[PDB]
Amino acid sequence: ACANLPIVRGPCRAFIQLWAFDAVKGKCVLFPYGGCQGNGNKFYSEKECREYCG
Amino acid sequence: IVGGYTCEENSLPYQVSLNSGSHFCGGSLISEQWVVSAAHCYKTRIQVRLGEHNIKVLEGNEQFINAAKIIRHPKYNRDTLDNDIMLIKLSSPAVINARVSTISLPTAPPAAGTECLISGWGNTLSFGADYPDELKCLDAPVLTQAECKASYPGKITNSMFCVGFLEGGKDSCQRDAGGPVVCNGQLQGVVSWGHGCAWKNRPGVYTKVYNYVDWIKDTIAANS
Ligand SMILES: [Ca+2]
């Protein structure tokens, strides 16, 4: 479900820390979202990300 | 901020840090109870920190004040970034003094060439990450609409202008969003976006504060 999405920071210049699936490593990780134009691979909690991904 | 210098302590008393536990954006104090920042810095809960210089060290003169209202521009567009501006109302008024004071809103858009002052606690590298403890500053000109559009074909809306150096090496950066671009005593811009930071031909893009002057007035009037 999440194996085909990269982690995208985007061009904005905030630091909104979020969760995303890292496809190489196989798990949910913390990443620094710039606040805009992400993809669907970002979640507010580890829990939310693990559920959406499996 | 990439390629700038550490500000003199408390010489930009309008600069604030927004904090949700750690610092994550900038802002500008525009009256005793209101701060301007970027819409994309939105979070549900935010603490405004005023009189900061070194955000990691308690220096004794900071004011820590929770946001009571956090109001994104009602036309902020997540797809194009049009109208990337936000207002925050403090839960109690800032105490104005030598270290904490307001920056005036602007009376005209700024002219191309005008030297401006951009500041905050964002990253200082174009490649890699080095987040500073002390406020950084940078002197940079406003660019023409033509250079700005040529740099970002198709993406520069009416709410946006560019400020920097086309040769690269100097720009705002992640964790600066929301912070001020001050030109001749006035708040002319808000740190918004770019491709990378300080890359050649990719100047910073900033929200035009002049265009929101009536919206700011109205929103202050309507939430008093
Ligand atoms: Ca401090």
3-state SS of chain A is CCCCCCCCCCCECCCEEEEEEECCCCEEEEEEECCCCCCCCCECCHHHHHHHHC
CA distance B132 to B144: 30
Given CA atoms B177, B181, B186, B188 in this order, what sign does their dihedral have?
Answer: negative
Query: By CB neighbour count within 10 A (0-12 exposed, 13-18 middle, 19+ buried), where does B158 fall?
Result: exposed
Is there a contact between B192 and A13 if contact means CB atoms under 8 Å apart? Answer: yes
Expressed as residue numbers, the domain containing A15 is 1-54
- Domain chopping of chain B, boundaries: 1-12+103-210, 13-102+211-223
Residues A26/A31/A36/A38 CA torsion (nearest 10 deg): -10
Q: A11 and B177 in contact by Cβ < 8 A? A: no
Distances (CA, A) of B75 to A13, B70, B212: 19, 15, 11
CB-CB under 8 Å, B24 with A13: no
Q: Which CATH superfamily is domain B13-102+211-223 in?
A: Trypsin-like serine proteases (2.40.10.10)
Documented resolution in Å: 2.5
Rounded distance between C-alpha atoms, residue A44 and residue A23, angstroms: 18
Distance B95 CA to ligand 1 centre (A): 17
Q: Which residues of B touch A34 (CB under 8 A)?
A: 40, 174, 177, 193
Residue type, B125: L
Q: Is the CATH number 2.40.10.10 carried by domain B1-12+103-210?
A: yes
Any idea what DSSP says for residue B42?
A: -
Instruction: Give the residue among B186, B145, B183, B182 at the shortest CA–CA distance from B162.
Output: B145
Locate B44 and state its tokens.
């549900």
Residue A42's CATH number: 4.10.410.10
Q: How many domains does chain A have?
A: 1
Distance, CA of A46 to CA of B157 (rounded, Å): 36
CA dihedral B10, B98, B190, B83 (to 10 degrees): 150
Solved with: X-ray
Tokens of A49: 């990300």
Query: How far is CA A25 from its chain centroid?
Result: 13
Whole-number Å distance between alpha carbons of B148 and B202: 9
- The length of chain B, given as a count of residues: 224
Interatomic CA distance for residues A39 and A32, integer angstroms: 13
